[PDB]
């Protein structure tokens, strides 16, 4: 789904990284209180952060 990520200006990249950090923090707190049938949504957030950082290292030469 990287094709979506290469379309975006460098500000919106950073905005999506901040949104992913917030969602990852809320998924931590919802693990700790015994919830979340969806436990495999966590890898998606980490790997989306990874893909955005690799793209922002690429377009920074």
């Amino acid at each position: 789904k990287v094709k979506e990520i290469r379309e975006l200006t460098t500000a919106e990249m950073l905005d999506k990284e901040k949104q992913l950090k917030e969602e990852l923090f809320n998924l931590r707190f919802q693990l700790a209180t015994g919830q979340l049938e969806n436990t495999a949504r966590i890898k998606e957030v980490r790997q989306s952060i990874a893909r955005i950082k690799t793209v922002l290292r690429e377009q920074a030469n």
Binding site: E22, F25, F29, A32, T33
Partner: protein, 89 residues
């Protein structure tokens, strides 16, 4: 980095007593100070002053299948408030 300070809340039998006097028990990562935990909580939940306290933990044993090995380190954080709540938990 300001958002990877806190990991979890500590939900234990003392901590449920601490919920009455606005005192909350979190697991803060190592190499963190008191002042970062103030800054992270205040920029994460709109709450205030009245100082944090910080512990440490020595690890233990477990022996599952005849293989001896430790567990992690920890660091609790017992945070008190002035005027708000965190009725999420």
């Amino acid at each position: 980095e300001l958002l990877d300070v806190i990991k979890r809340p500590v939900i234990t039998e003392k901590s449920m007593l601490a919920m009455d006097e606005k005192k909350y028990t979190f697991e803060v990562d190592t190499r963190a100070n008191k002042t970062l935990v103030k800054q992270a909580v205040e920029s994460a939940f709109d709450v205030k002053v009245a100082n944090v306290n910080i512990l440490n933990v020595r690890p233990k044993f477990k022996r599952m299948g005849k293989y001896a090995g430790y567990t992690k380190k920890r660091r609790k954080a017992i945070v008190t408030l002035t005027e708000d709540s965190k009725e999420i938990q």
